[PDB]
């Protein structure tokens, strides 16, 4: 998934916006993937 970034793959983000103009993109990627994993673990706990 993308989560509103300009590229889903992280390697593209670091290779186009450098560190100082991409950390927001990594920020969004990290928070989105973390939220997805949180939903997954919650569902897994319910099923368990």
């Amino acid at each position: 998934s993308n989560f509103g970034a300009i590229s889903s793959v992280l390697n593209d983000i670091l290779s186009r916006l450098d560190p100082p103009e991409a950390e927001v993109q990594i920020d969004r990627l990290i928070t989105g993937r973390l939220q997805s994993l949180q939903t997954y673990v919650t569902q897994q706990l319910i099923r368990a």
């Binding site: 450098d18 560190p19 100082p20 103009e21 950390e23």
Partner: protein
């Protein structure tokens, strides 16, 4: 007026007026990369 710090540092130099905006973290320019570089995780003030 109501803070304290471990240590205070000052940097003084001479630059052209058109290149004053180059003094900021994450900016790209000849002064930025060959003359004076500022860290991304920086906190300070600019006076000119």
């Amino acid at each position: 007026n109501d803070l304290c710090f471990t240590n205070v540092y000052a940097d003084s130099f001479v630059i052209r007026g058109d290149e004053v905006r180059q003094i900021a973290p994450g900016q790209t320019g000849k002064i930025a990369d060959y003359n004076y570089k500022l860290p991304d995780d920086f906190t300070g003030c600019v006076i000119a």
